[PDB]
Amino acid sequence: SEEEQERIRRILKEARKSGTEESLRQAIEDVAQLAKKSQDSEVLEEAIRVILRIAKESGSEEALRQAIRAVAEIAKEAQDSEVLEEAIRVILRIAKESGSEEALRQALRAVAEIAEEAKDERVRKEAVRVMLQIAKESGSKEAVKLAFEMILRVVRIIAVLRANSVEEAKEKALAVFEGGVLAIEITFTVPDADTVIKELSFLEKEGAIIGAGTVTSVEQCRKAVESGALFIVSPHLDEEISQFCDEAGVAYAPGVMTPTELVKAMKLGHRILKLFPGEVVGPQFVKAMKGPFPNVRFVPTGGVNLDNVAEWFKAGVLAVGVGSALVKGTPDEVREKAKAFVEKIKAA
Amino acid sequence: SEEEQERIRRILKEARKSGTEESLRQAIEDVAQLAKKSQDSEVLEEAIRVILRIAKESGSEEALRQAIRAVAEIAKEAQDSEVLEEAIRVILRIAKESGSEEALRQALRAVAEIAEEAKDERVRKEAVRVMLQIAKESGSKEAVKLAFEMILRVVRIIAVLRANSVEEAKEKALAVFEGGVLAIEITFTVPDADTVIKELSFLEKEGAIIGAGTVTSVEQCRKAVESGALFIVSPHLDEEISQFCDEAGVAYAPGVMTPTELVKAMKLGHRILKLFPGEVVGPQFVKAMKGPFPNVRFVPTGGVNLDNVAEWFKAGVLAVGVGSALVKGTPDEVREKAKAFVEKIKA
Amino acid sequence: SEEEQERIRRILKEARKSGTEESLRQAIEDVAQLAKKSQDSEVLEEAIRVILRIAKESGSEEALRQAIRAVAEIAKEAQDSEVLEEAIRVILRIAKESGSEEALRQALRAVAEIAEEAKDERVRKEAVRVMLQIAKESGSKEAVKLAFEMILRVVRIIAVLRANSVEEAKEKALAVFEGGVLAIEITFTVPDADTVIKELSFLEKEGAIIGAGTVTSVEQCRKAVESGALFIVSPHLDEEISQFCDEAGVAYAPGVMTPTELVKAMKLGHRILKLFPGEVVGPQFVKAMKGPFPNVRFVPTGGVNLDNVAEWFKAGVLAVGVGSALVKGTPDEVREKAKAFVEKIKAA
């Protein structure tokens, strides 16, 4: 393997000596070509970190975007999760260098695709934290919705927590974390809900996402975004709120229940919707919405349980919002329920 | 105990000779104190008469509204229903002399709370009759809404009546009233429904409340009122009907089906909503709305049947609207199904 | 027999010698009297030629409309389909001679009623073909709505086509037409639905009716009606589409799901509504709507299948919109399942 290792170095030294820009992007495809013929974990990591310096020296977005597709292909060919974690951190470095958001959208879809074919949770925890930073590093009008859509596509399950004692609530939030589902949503009905989402903001740095729900007024939503909420679930579409999330750069997934309410939600720029109550319309609703409204996905949060969640995802839902069937009870028991829901989603 | 009648008459005569309003408000507290130590039905009902005698002599709003709480507390401590019937009639007379919306609102919640703990059909009939008269006074928007809300809490079940003639509707409404159903909704599918609600006005004197359902227009609602209806029930949310019902002083329960329609109904000022069709959304909808909308209560009028009616009230529902499953058949059949629904609602 | 045929010749010759319109009006009821007493496919279909033949006194919406009820009565008592076909064509010529709005609307209900006694389907295809020409003679807003209601009253089932090419959409449309489904809705998920509607416009002269579905904008709706669409279908209620469909003389069935959406559609002048998704609310919804809204008809286009369509019509639905369960598969499969849907509706 030391022979091809030197070969990757020889391509580098000769590509730098070649002042032509075509040989620079050609060196990207040359390194990717030999990485496709390899089967070792360490070889793919050296190849990926090599493509970084080539495109950054080119200074053109055509080489940066071509590098994102190369590292994403090497990560799909690999088998060690160590290379996948470095691939995600590398894609962040490429997209951050361009910063033109044409690559940021492509980087998010690549990061979420790498986390999709992941055997352990460490890769998915790396992804969610990076996609948050990618949307944060972007800091613009879009990307937050694409991050929200992709992160939900990775975490698959979002919990609905409610407890009067913040001591008991955080005992459940960490507990549902321990199951590995991540992406916990806390209800705003809880009296000291501002504090629970601020003290649980340390989960954001470990691969989780915290948000507020049942938000009905702009004043209540302002309190959530100041406390650390990254998404506002809501019970029904609100015109005043939806304009505040777009100005504040926070994702907003309003609640709909009929196709007519769906169209009014799309008229305000919301293709990520909340199906509420989900148990009322059932999975037949999301199946019937695919035809007339493609590329539009929902997150049903109603009477979803272990018997329901199996047939919600076969209908093509983005994520599912479970509440009493997951969080209610002692913390150690909802850790086993959080593991049970993840196991049920991965199968059907 | 005859000694308590003396002591009660001593507290009145002593505080009457004083005349100071400080001692008069203390006389209500002294009479209410001895009433809590006694278990005689005649000692308690005499204390209620004296509490009224003291308050109406004081004349102040503070003393009159304190007398309402005292009479209401004596009712909660009593077992004889004749004490509760007397308390309701006294609560009416105290708020009637006082006036203002605060006393009349406090009286509406008091006589309705007494009706729940009464566990007797006679007291619930009197509560409806008094609450209608309390709402007839003042006549404010908040009075007719609160009175309609408390009345639905007491009767628990409203009958959606449909027939093929005025006489068949009159006999069905009387039959369902004998079963224990005190609230009757007359749809406009019955021919001459305005004549049916007009000739059924004698039931409102025996503890009933007749209204009009299936109201689609304002011309339809204008004929429902003036003909004697006390509440208007529509399958959807109408902006003009809610306007006409507000300025006419009549309760209005519109129909909703989705949380988006719920919020729009609250924006108009209605927190007592008709869930229609209730059989489509099911009790899962009512439990789901309790979270973000706690101060909103529903009345499902869909496929409410003896099987699911138990599950509806287990979901925190104000009242249920039944039809066909209740009002279909002979008057004898309606009377027995009326007794069956009231029995299963008691749970 | 022909002893009655000679009598009909005498009724016409003698009443024509009189010339008084009261005797020509009596000649119609005399012919319809002896036609009621006879059972002969040749005596009946000749009696209605004479009733049409007695147009010497122009009804001007008096004698002509008396002729329509007489020929519609002869067709009701008949059994031979050749008499029913001749009755429909004669009613068209009588209403075309009058030109009044009452005669044209009375002819629509007469022709549609003749097709309800079905058996041979060429009558139903001729009825739809004739009812379209009647609506184009009137051209009023009431005529387009009534003709659309009557055609759906006859065809009972609408095919909701979704394809991935113009050629597969054309082939499936021909396949569902040969199966017995005379109503075809071309969704805009098809790449070039306008050309599909345009190339399928020849079926409208054979007894079919081509329309567009899943329309969201007025630009979409204008291209559909300019391509040959005779009815516009949307998943929700669009105020601007209803405005354009009115001034363009094209039927429009909006989508409703709650009773409040029902009322908002009626106040715009729509009593033929699309219940969507029908599988979510179920036939319990349409049964409960007939109480407050007896004039509304509904066409459920949800999860309609062979097990569903039986209990949809028992609840009194006008027509049903079937897709996937009818359109998906090879063109050879969708022919035989179209025959099964038509056969299942005929029974229950």
Numbering used by the authors:
A (entry chain B), C (entry chain C): 1 to 348
B (entry chain A): 1 to 347
Copy text verbatim from the article accompanying this structure deposition.
We develop a hierarchical approach to designing multi-component protein assemblies from two classes of modular building blocks: designed helical repeat proteins (DHRs) and helical bundle oligomers (HBs). We first rigidly fuse DHRs to HBs to generate a large library of oligomeric building blocks. We then generate assemblies with cyclic, dihedral, and point group symmetries from these building blocks using architecture guided rigid helical fusion with new software named WORMS. X-ray crystallography and cryo-electron microscopy characterization show that the hierarchical design approach can accurately generate a wide range of assemblies, including a 43 nm diameter icosahedral nanocage.
For the second approach, HelixFuse (HF), the same set of DHRs and HBs were combinatorially fused together by overlapping the terminal helix residues in both directions (“AB”: c-terminus of HB to n-terminus of DHR, “BA”: n-terminus of HB to c-terminus of DHR). We were able to solve the X-ray crystal structure of C3_nat_HF-0005 to 3.32 Å resolution.
